[PDB]
Design a binder for these strands. Structure first.
Ligand SMILES: NC[C@@H]1O[C@H](O[C@H]2[C@@H](O)[C@H](O[C@@H]3[C@@H](O)[C@H](N)C[C@H](N)[C@H]3O[C@H]3O[C@H](CO)[C@@H](O)[C@H](O)[C@H]3N)O[C@@H]2CO)[C@H](N)[C@@H](O)[C@@H]1O
Ligand SMILES: [Mg+2]
Ligand SMILES: [Mg+2]
Ligand SMILES: [Mg+2]
Ligand SMILES: [Mg+2]
Ligand SMILES: [Mg+2]
Ligand SMILES: [Mg+2]
Ligand SMILES: [Mg+2]
Ligand SMILES: [Mg+2]
Ligand SMILES: [Mg+2]
Ligand SMILES: [Mg+2]
Ligand SMILES: [Mg+2]
Ligand SMILES: [Mg+2]
Ligand SMILES: [Mg+2]
Ligand SMILES: [Mg+2]
Ligand SMILES: [Mg+2]
Ligand SMILES: [Mg+2]
Ligand SMILES: [Mg+2]
Ligand SMILES: [Mg+2]
Ligand SMILES: [Mg+2]
Ligand SMILES: [Mg+2]
Ligand SMILES: [Mg+2]
Ligand SMILES: [Mg+2]
Ligand SMILES: [Mg+2]
Ligand SMILES: [Mg+2]
Ligand SMILES: [Mg+2]
Ligand SMILES: [Mg+2]
Ligand SMILES: [Mg+2]
Ligand SMILES: [Mg+2]
Ligand SMILES: [Mg+2]
Ligand SMILES: [Mg+2]
Ligand SMILES: [Mg+2]
Ligand SMILES: [Mg+2]
Ligand SMILES: [Mg+2]
Ligand SMILES: [Mg+2]
Ligand SMILES: [Mg+2]
Ligand SMILES: [Mg+2]
Ligand SMILES: [Mg+2]
Ligand SMILES: [Mg+2]
Ligand SMILES: [Mg+2]
Ligand SMILES: [Mg+2]
Ligand SMILES: [Mg+2]
Ligand SMILES: [Mg+2]
Ligand SMILES: [Mg+2]
Ligand SMILES: [Mg+2]
Ligand SMILES: [Mg+2]
Ligand SMILES: [Mg+2]
Ligand SMILES: [Mg+2]
Ligand SMILES: [Mg+2]
Ligand SMILES: [Mg+2]
Ligand SMILES: [Mg+2]
Ligand SMILES: [Mg+2]
Ligand SMILES: [Mg+2]
Ligand SMILES: [Mg+2]
Ligand SMILES: [Mg+2]
Ligand SMILES: [Mg+2]
Ligand SMILES: [Mg+2]
Ligand SMILES: [Mg+2]
Ligand SMILES: [Mg+2]
Ligand SMILES: [Mg+2]
Ligand SMILES: [Mg+2]
Ligand SMILES: [Mg+2]
Ligand SMILES: [Mg+2]
Ligand SMILES: [Mg+2]
Ligand SMILES: [Mg+2]
Ligand SMILES: [Mg+2]
Ligand SMILES: [Mg+2]
Ligand SMILES: [Mg+2]
Ligand SMILES: [Mg+2]
Ligand SMILES: [Mg+2]
Ligand SMILES: [Mg+2]
Ligand SMILES: [Mg+2]
Ligand SMILES: [Mg+2]
Ligand SMILES: [Mg+2]
Ligand SMILES: [Mg+2]
Ligand SMILES: [Mg+2]
Ligand SMILES: [Mg+2]
Ligand SMILES: [Mg+2]
Ligand SMILES: [Mg+2]
Ligand SMILES: [Mg+2]
Ligand SMILES: [Mg+2]
Ligand SMILES: [Mg+2]
Ligand SMILES: [Mg+2]
Ligand SMILES: [Mg+2]
Ligand SMILES: [Mg+2]
Ligand SMILES: [Mg+2]
Ligand SMILES: [Mg+2]
Ligand SMILES: [Mg+2]
Ligand SMILES: [Mg+2]
Ligand SMILES: [Mg+2]
Ligand SMILES: [Mg+2]
Ligand SMILES: [Mg+2]
Ligand SMILES: [Mg+2]
Ligand SMILES: [Mg+2]
Ligand SMILES: [Mg+2]
Ligand SMILES: [Mg+2]
Ligand SMILES: [Mg+2]
Ligand SMILES: [Mg+2]
Ligand SMILES: [Mg+2]
Ligand SMILES: [Mg+2]
Ligand SMILES: [Mg+2]
Ligand SMILES: [Mg+2]
Ligand SMILES: [Mg+2]
Ligand SMILES: [Mg+2]
Ligand SMILES: [Mg+2]
Ligand SMILES: [Mg+2]
Ligand SMILES: [Mg+2]
Ligand SMILES: [Mg+2]
Ligand SMILES: [Mg+2]
Ligand SMILES: [Mg+2]
Ligand SMILES: [Mg+2]
Ligand SMILES: [Mg+2]
Ligand SMILES: [Mg+2]
Ligand SMILES: [Mg+2]
Ligand SMILES: [Mg+2]
Ligand SMILES: [Mg+2]
Ligand SMILES: [Mg+2]
Ligand SMILES: [Mg+2]
Ligand SMILES: [Mg+2]
Ligand SMILES: [Mg+2]
Ligand SMILES: [Mg+2]
Ligand SMILES: [Mg+2]
Ligand SMILES: [Mg+2]
Ligand SMILES: [Mg+2]
Ligand SMILES: [Mg+2]
Ligand SMILES: [Mg+2]
Ligand SMILES: [Mg+2]
Ligand SMILES: [Mg+2]
Ligand SMILES: [Mg+2]
Ligand SMILES: [Mg+2]
Ligand SMILES: [Mg+2]
Ligand SMILES: [Mg+2]
Ligand SMILES: [Mg+2]
Ligand SMILES: [Mg+2]
Ligand SMILES: [Mg+2]
Ligand SMILES: [Mg+2]
Ligand SMILES: [Mg+2]
Ligand SMILES: [Mg+2]
Ligand SMILES: [Mg+2]
Ligand SMILES: [Mg+2]
Ligand SMILES: [Mg+2]
Ligand SMILES: [Mg+2]
Ligand SMILES: [Mg+2]
Ligand SMILES: [Mg+2]
Ligand SMILES: [Mg+2]
Ligand SMILES: [Mg+2]
Ligand SMILES: [Mg+2]
Ligand SMILES: [Mg+2]
Ligand SMILES: [Mg+2]
Ligand SMILES: [Mg+2]
Ligand SMILES: [Mg+2]
Ligand SMILES: [Mg+2]
Ligand SMILES: [Mg+2]
Ligand SMILES: [Mg+2]
Ligand SMILES: [Mg+2]
Ligand SMILES: [Mg+2]
Ligand SMILES: [Mg+2]
Ligand SMILES: [Mg+2]
Ligand SMILES: [Mg+2]
Ligand SMILES: [Mg+2]
Ligand SMILES: [Mg+2]
Ligand SMILES: [Mg+2]
Ligand SMILES: [Mg+2]
Ligand SMILES: [Mg+2]
Ligand SMILES: [Mg+2]
Lengths: 49, 272
RNA sequence: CGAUGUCGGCUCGUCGCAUCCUGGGGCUGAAGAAGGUCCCAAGGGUUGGGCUGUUCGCCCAUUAAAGCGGCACGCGAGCUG
RNA sequence: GAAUGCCGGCAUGAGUAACGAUAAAGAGGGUGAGAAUCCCUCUCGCCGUAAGCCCAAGGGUUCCUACGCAAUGGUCGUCAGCGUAGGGUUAGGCGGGACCUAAGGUGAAGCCGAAAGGCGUAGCCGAAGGGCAGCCGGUUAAUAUUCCGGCCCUUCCCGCAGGUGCGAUGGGGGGACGCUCUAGGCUAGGGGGACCGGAGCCAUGGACGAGCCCGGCCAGAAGCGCAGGGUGGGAGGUAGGCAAAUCCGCCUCCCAACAAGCUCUGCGUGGUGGGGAAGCCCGUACGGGUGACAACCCCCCGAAGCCAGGGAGCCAAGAAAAGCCUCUAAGCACAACCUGCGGGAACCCGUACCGCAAACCGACACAGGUGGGCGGGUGCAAGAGCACUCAGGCGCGCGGGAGAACCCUCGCCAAGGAACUCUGCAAGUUGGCCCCGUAACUUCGGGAGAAGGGGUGCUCCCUGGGGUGAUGAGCCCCGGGGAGCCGCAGUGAACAGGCUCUGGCGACUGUUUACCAAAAACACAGCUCUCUGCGAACUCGUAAGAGGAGGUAUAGGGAGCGACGCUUGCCCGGUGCCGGAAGGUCAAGGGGAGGGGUGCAAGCCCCGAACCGAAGCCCCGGUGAACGGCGGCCGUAACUAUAACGGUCCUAAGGUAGCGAAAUUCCUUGUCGGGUAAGUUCCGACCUGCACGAAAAGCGUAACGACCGGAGCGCUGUCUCGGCGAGGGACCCGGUGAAAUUGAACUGGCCGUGAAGAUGCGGCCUACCCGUGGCAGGACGAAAAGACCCCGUGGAGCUUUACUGCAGCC
RNA sequence: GAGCUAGCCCUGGCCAGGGUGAAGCUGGGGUGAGACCCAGUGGAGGCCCGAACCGGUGGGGGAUGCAAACCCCUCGGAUGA
RNA sequence: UGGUUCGUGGAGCCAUGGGGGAAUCUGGGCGGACCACCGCCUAAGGCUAAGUACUCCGGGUGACCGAUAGCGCACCAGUAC
RNA sequence: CGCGGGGUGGAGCAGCCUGGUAGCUCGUCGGGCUCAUAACCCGAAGGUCGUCGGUUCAAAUCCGGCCCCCGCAACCA
RNA sequence: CCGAGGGUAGGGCCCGUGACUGGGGCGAAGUCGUAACAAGGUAGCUGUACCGGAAGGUGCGGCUGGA
RNA sequence: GUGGGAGAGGGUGGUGGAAUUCCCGGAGUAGCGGUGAAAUGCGCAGAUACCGGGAGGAACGCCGAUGGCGAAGGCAGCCACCUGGUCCACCCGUGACGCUGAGGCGCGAAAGCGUGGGGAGCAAACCGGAUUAGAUACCCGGGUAGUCCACGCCCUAAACG
């Protein structure tokens, strides 16, 4: 059947990107938490040009 | 007149379509004056706030003239009468000698080629606009302003009118389509005649689809729902209500008057 | 009750006898034929259909007869639903 | 030592089930330490509106080459999408960006919000939408519309030359638009050819023949030709297009009414460039050479594509902005702008490969899911259907034998034809097309493919219409009539309704529980009620604001009923709602009669009765397509029976019409009648309606239904009652090799007994040790800390005249 | 968190081939004019058969599956809500 | 209304959203309703070290662990997945 | 089986809970009106209060046991 | 070839019969009520509509077969 | 044909006053309505009666007749438009052109049906209050369809002279 993962580079970027997270206090805290944690990747790596 | 069909299909046996014979050879509209992009959307910034809206034909807005006092004294020739997707009535395309082209909402009896004009001057004829004062008591009228210089707001639906009843210092009394008795300021413009397309009420949609074409989504009964959804939801195999009938939001829907009492508008109203 | 799947049907049977039939027998208000009733006896047999989920039952057409009951109202790691 | 304990390790089931579509394989020869599995050739099979080819998304090195085989591959592996290394992705014209706007997003001004933040015209961002200049070949092992060859374009910038008032983010024009049906002329693509080109080929009885086989094109500027799209020309007057216009618009006169003229596309033609089979020889993993100076021509079919803003019709009335044309303003007119020709300038990102899939989403090389374009031939009425088959791609990454039961899938059957069973569930008959021919009923359309029939192949003869061609041949479509031929059978294979009668429910097409319900449930046009006068009602939000609506009573919200037909009776006592400037009660407040605490007092500070005081309630009226409700007990007719009639009690009023043992009837298989040999069902009646009933509508209704019930016809393996056959497993061998489960086990029956159902206790009976294929009675067999039930002062969802608050409104 | 799912908004795309034959238009007829009736043309429809496609009706298989919803035969819609 | 031990209590004091609304030392607040007396302070402007909290970071010590312990990580761990 | 409501002149109903008096309508009877009957008018008659028990000074009335009558209930399995 | 006739399939008409139901006719002395004929005690009759155990009533308009 | 005449003959538009009912304002009290008699009903929440204003609908007093017009059904305030029939004078024209009329077609009171509108008075049904033995009637108080309009059906009558 159709499963739940339907990859889209634009969606992933607009949805979970560094700039989206930065836009709101909710998201800014996510970066803070991930930084303090020592996460190698703050936001998902969306590729291609 | 109303177009009628034979039952060559079920739902074609009741279905019924407007007569478009008053639609003069001018079916597609007029750029310049209108159209605008019209912005379909069944809801506010976010959430739906009027249920069951959506779908249905794309539209172009015809930006019509609801304040006729710009062109006081300037007459215009009625050039055409065309279909307007965004109202019950039809619209008149008129050419002002000025050059300017406006649409007026098209009254019953309006003929193409006719002369029409607005102002204190203005022969009392179908199509003309006047401040309510100079209009003879008892004449039927439409596109009436509520307060002066604020635009036509009463009687624009197809086949509607108001009748002038009497006067009272600065106000003339109106009898509105609903039957209400209203004091409306003398200085309010209103155009003589009834609205026309009066056979609009006689049309039978005929099937579900037609409803959808006009963007009317299926309306579901409270009875059909559940207690979470509606006062009428549940219980077992059908149910008669079990309380005084209500809206989904709990207010009673048979009888409960809802106009606020202390409206300052009150001292200008005399009926139902 | 940290689970003994619960009606009926089907499938496969098997057992008890307080025996429906067949074998044996006494009494009979047993002429004979056919019955009645009790005793011995389970080796074998104990049909097909209509209605009903039905068990049962009521019919239909037959029959030597169309037996009662037990096996977790036998049998769902065998089927059905 | 126990916690269905936690982490780890190793057992058991077990050499067991399985090894992922039943599209299928065989052989010869290579390589190699080692071949069913790798390369090659020959034969065979499968796809072919794909299982072929091309884009997009996603993926990200998987592409190409060399060397490798521990692991990954469900077996093997010399192989690989695997490991090591090296290479490979070339653009002014393709896509995206230094262009534009959509929904939405962001957002200066502005508004709002305890903070965070929320709105928000202009603007900005935002694209498979608009705008926009490259086509055809050749090369690499791996890229090419990117490199190269030919031919052809676009922007800039700077020059010369010739024109004109030039000139804006500003005005106007355009861009610019629906759905169905569509004409004319074209291309794509396809079929035919006695014509042209071509290696070859006569087989096995015959054929050296207009014999077979293969192939007969592609691109292409200017100029032409054929189609076709767009479009009037003057002159006046001018107050509108938010300054200004000569522009547009509006009025008025003249000339056109035409595509005549101007453009602008498409298609043919074109200087030129290029391609070019079968077969044979070769050595590749594959391509190369020859065939060749290849030929490259005539017919016919023909689009859904092109001309495109074509045309007609209809109602539900069908984006925006820039580029582009023009108009003028500030300014500038030694500028500038248009046209022609030269020269120079032309950046950024993508480009590999996969792509209906072993490279994407499903933990897997997973029988699943995944958007757009091409998708040849023949036959079957047509077609993207179905059978075969081009091109091209595959044989699905375990095999080999065997020929048990049993299962899956499939084929056939004597005689009977539903006796099967909950039910004709399943399976069968039926089936395409042409022509006969069709009932009740009906909303006049339908019911209709009703039903029921007949025709269907091939051969020869006569003969009628068109289409393309000149009015003709051919070629291509449709027809008619006449003889005859063969077979069990002519839509000879594949695709292709079983039919009728009668009830229930719903009018109808639609929708729904994604993953057990597709329905009689939801929806539906339509009907009635009720709110709403516009800063509407209502809804979301603390607000600002937004929806409603750029609407305005023929409109918008809420509620029910649910096409249509005939209709929807009585009760307003209670509850609801609606209406009542009386009254009663009613809070803060007002008012202070009156009294209190301190003070030597002036004073300060306390309570506090009258009385004036809202809505709400009470009270008075209305209202049922508002919530709801719509009786009992006796008696009576000149045979009995029964009760039109009467008495009485109570109610707010005592169910009318119509229906009724019903999706409603407990007693119940009610009682009659019909179908049947037989009928708890079914149909028609009666009414004794436990417990129908009129918009939670009542009684009907043509038509419709993967709904539900009953009957018959037809037909059958459903059954009597099975039998045989096929293939995929099951079984034996070689290779890889799990699982839940498991206190340990050296794990028999009977009658007992034991917490009451014993392999384990007693007595007795039976019984040599170990397996393999099978069957499921048992191990209260596995699986889930029972769903039902109860319990816990456990939890949630829901309700209301439970309590208490809150939003909201008064 | 709406890359599954529900609804809506903006912008694109798809729907072979067959049947049935509404209005209207045209001629003829009828009348005083009409209505109306005959053809012929016309090509409408939440119309019909049927692919793609969108579904998921009945039965079987599958049940440590190919698959945490699948496969086989069958079946509903397929110009529209 | 909040704060205080103070939950309306005889309910003060300190803050305040709403209404009314003074005075400048013979002026004002307070000592738990209030009043008298006796006393204590001088509101409606601001600043102000140190003593006090914490431990990312360095150092020291341990009747603290010793690779299922000790930080999740003694090991290229907030990694693989 | 459980529950709660009911038996009163000839008919239908009141009278009970706050024990002492049994009342209403109809019917029946006698008379009057009418030629006659009904209607109407004047008079009258009429009740072991389902049975059994005792509580009281006293039971239709209060409390128990039976008896018919009516209505409700019988649910999860 | 046609063809009596048989077979199958579906229609049309007529007659017979059917639980039950509809109204009707007729039958000396059963029930209820009083509609009509006299101004029949509400003039009557009428087409229509609604309601009612029944004759019948009432609404609307009409007629003289009444003042 | 020329020339005139009477008319409630027909359709469409427009308009006038009297009266009824509801609303508002003034003034005003203790009852008003109603019948055979009453009661229901209305009224100190200010009725009835009177005055002033407003709205709305239907029907047209006097003229009016025992009259006129029409083929009937039927037609009645006034105005205008459009239109049918008809009668007289003159005897000018045509010149037998006539009468009736199965069927067809049209018209056809009232009540009734559909869609929409309108709704003041009246009023089936319906609810009350009296009357009666009972009253589903007659009388009284209310009251919905309908009565009115547009369009479309219905085709009946003591459509009677
Ligand atoms: N009579 C002809 C028609 O039928 C009916 O008439 C029938 C009945 O109504 C009528 O019944 C009458 C009754 O009306 C009258 N008031 C009392 C009488 N005793 C009855 O009598 C009837 O029944 C008895 C048996 O009991 C028979 O013997 C007698 O012949 C018969 N007429 O008897 C008639 C039978 O012939 C209609 N009512 C009448 O108006 C109508 O025109
Ligand atoms: Mg919002
Ligand atoms: Mg937002
Ligand atoms: Mg309507
Ligand atoms: Mg609904
Ligand atoms: Mg529900
Ligand atoms: Mg709720
Ligand atoms: Mg129910
Ligand atoms: Mg109820
Ligand atoms: Mg409810
Ligand atoms: Mg248990
Ligand atoms: Mg256990
Ligand atoms: Mg178990
Ligand atoms: Mg014995
Ligand atoms: Mg004997
Ligand atoms: Mg059965
Ligand atoms: Mg037995
Ligand atoms: Mg038992
Ligand atoms: Mg049993
Ligand atoms: Mg059992
Ligand atoms: Mg078992
Ligand atoms: Mg079941
Ligand atoms: Mg222990
Ligand atoms: Mg373990
Ligand atoms: Mg085993
Ligand atoms: Mg095995
Ligand atoms: Mg195996
Ligand atoms: Mg495989
Ligand atoms: Mg095959
Ligand atoms: Mg070798
Ligand atoms: Mg094949
Ligand atoms: Mg790699
Ligand atoms: Mg490779
Ligand atoms: Mg190699
Ligand atoms: Mg291997
Ligand atoms: Mg090797
Ligand atoms: Mg590699
Ligand atoms: Mg640049
Ligand atoms: Mg940009
Ligand atoms: Mg924002
Ligand atoms: Mg915006
Ligand atoms: Mg932009
Ligand atoms: Mg584009
Ligand atoms: Mg481009
Ligand atoms: Mg490649
Ligand atoms: Mg090049
Ligand atoms: Mg210029
Ligand atoms: Mg512009
Ligand atoms: Mg070509
Ligand atoms: Mg030979
Ligand atoms: Mg060819
Ligand atoms: Mg200007
Ligand atoms: Mg070649
Ligand atoms: Mg066009
Ligand atoms: Mg712009
Ligand atoms: Mg590339
Ligand atoms: Mg590529
Ligand atoms: Mg594809
Ligand atoms: Mg692949
Ligand atoms: Mg594989
Ligand atoms: Mg796959
Ligand atoms: Mg995969
Ligand atoms: Mg797909
Ligand atoms: Mg094709
Ligand atoms: Mg093909
Ligand atoms: Mg073909
Ligand atoms: Mg075909
Ligand atoms: Mg195919
Ligand atoms: Mg057989
Ligand atoms: Mg046979
Ligand atoms: Mg048969
Ligand atoms: Mg049977
Ligand atoms: Mg049986
Ligand atoms: Mg059946
Ligand atoms: Mg079947
Ligand atoms: Mg039928
Ligand atoms: Mg034959
Ligand atoms: Mg349905
Ligand atoms: Mg489901
Ligand atoms: Mg299902
Ligand atoms: Mg269905
Ligand atoms: Mg309806
Ligand atoms: Mg708004
Ligand atoms: Mg709006
Ligand atoms: Mg319903
Ligand atoms: Mg009702
Ligand atoms: Mg009530
Ligand atoms: Mg009430
Ligand atoms: Mg009331
Ligand atoms: Mg009130
Ligand atoms: Mg007070
Ligand atoms: Mg009050
Ligand atoms: Mg009734
Ligand atoms: Mg019955
Ligand atoms: Mg029977
Ligand atoms: Mg049968
Ligand atoms: Mg029978
Ligand atoms: Mg029945
Ligand atoms: Mg019901
Ligand atoms: Mg109802
Ligand atoms: Mg219904
Ligand atoms: Mg029914
Ligand atoms: Mg039906
Ligand atoms: Mg359906
Ligand atoms: Mg269905
Ligand atoms: Mg079989
Ligand atoms: Mg077999
Ligand atoms: Mg086999
Ligand atoms: Mg093996
Ligand atoms: Mg266990
Ligand atoms: Mg042993
Ligand atoms: Mg035992
Ligand atoms: Mg032992
Ligand atoms: Mg033992
Ligand atoms: Mg074994
Ligand atoms: Mg077993
Ligand atoms: Mg087994
Ligand atoms: Mg078991
Ligand atoms: Mg438990
Ligand atoms: Mg408790
Ligand atoms: Mg979505
Ligand atoms: Mg089609
Ligand atoms: Mg036609
Ligand atoms: Mg069609
Ligand atoms: Mg369709
Ligand atoms: Mg396609
Ligand atoms: Mg679905
Ligand atoms: Mg299925
Ligand atoms: Mg199974
Ligand atoms: Mg299908
Ligand atoms: Mg269909
Ligand atoms: Mg279909
Ligand atoms: Mg506090
Ligand atoms: Mg304050
Ligand atoms: Mg203070
Ligand atoms: Mg103080
Ligand atoms: Mg102090
Ligand atoms: Mg103190
Ligand atoms: Mg102090
Ligand atoms: Mg240690
Ligand atoms: Mg550790
Ligand atoms: Mg260690
Ligand atoms: Mg750890
Ligand atoms: Mg007497
Ligand atoms: Mg339960
Ligand atoms: Mg329960
Ligand atoms: Mg008969
Ligand atoms: Mg009478
Ligand atoms: Mg009489
Ligand atoms: Mg009378
Ligand atoms: Mg009458
Ligand atoms: Mg009456
Ligand atoms: Mg007579
Ligand atoms: Mg007054
Ligand atoms: Mg005249
Ligand atoms: Mg003469
Ligand atoms: Mg003559
Ligand atoms: Mg005549
Ligand atoms: Mg009539
Ligand atoms: Mg009438
Ligand atoms: Mg009616
Ligand atoms: Mg009407
Ligand atoms: Mg009245
Ligand atoms: Mg009355
Ligand atoms: Mg007469």
């Amino acid at each position: 059947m159709k499963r739940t993962w339907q990859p889209n580079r634009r969606k992933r970027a607009k949805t979970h990107g560094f700039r989206a997270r930065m836009r709101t206090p909710g998201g800014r805290k996510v970066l803070k938490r991930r930084r303090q944690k020592g996460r190698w990747r703050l936001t998902p790596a969306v590729r291609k040009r | 007149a109303v177009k009628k069909f034979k039952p060559y299909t079920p739902s074609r046996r009741f279905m019924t379509v407007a007569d478009f014979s008053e639609i003069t050879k001018t079916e597609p509209e007029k750029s310049l004056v209108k159209p605008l992009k019209k912005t379909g959307g069944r809801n506010n910034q976010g959430r739906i706030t009027v249920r069951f809206r959506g779908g249905g034909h794309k539209r172009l807005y015809r930006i019509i003239d609801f304040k006729r006092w710009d062109k006081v004294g300037i007459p215009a020739k009625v050039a055409a009468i065309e279909y307007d997707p965004n109202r019950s009535a039809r619209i008149a395309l008129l050419h002002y000698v000025d050059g300017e082209k406006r649409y007026i909402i098209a009254p019953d009896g309006l003929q193409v080629g006719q002369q029409v004009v607005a102002g204190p001057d203005a022969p009392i004829q179908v199509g003309n606009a006047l401040p309510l004062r100079f209009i003879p008591v008892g004449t039927v009228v439409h596109a009436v302003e509520l307060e002066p210089k604020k635009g036509a707001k009463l009687a624009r639906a197809a086949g509607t009118s108001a009748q002038i009843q009497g006067r009272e210092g600065d106000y003339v009394i109106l009898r509105l389509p609903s039957g209400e008795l209203r004091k409306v300021h003398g200085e309010c413009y209103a155009t003589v005649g009834a609205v026309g397309n009066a056979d609009h009420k006689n049309i039978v949609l005929g099937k579900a689809g037609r409803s959808r074409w006009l963007g009317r989504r299926p309306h579901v009964r409270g009875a059909a729902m559940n207690p979470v959804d509606h006062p009428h939801g549940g219980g077992e195999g059908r149910a008669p209500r079990g309380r005084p009938p209500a809206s989904p939001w709990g207010w009673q829907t048979k009888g409960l008057k809802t106009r606020k009492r202390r409206k300052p508008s009150s001292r200008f109203i005399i009926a139902r």
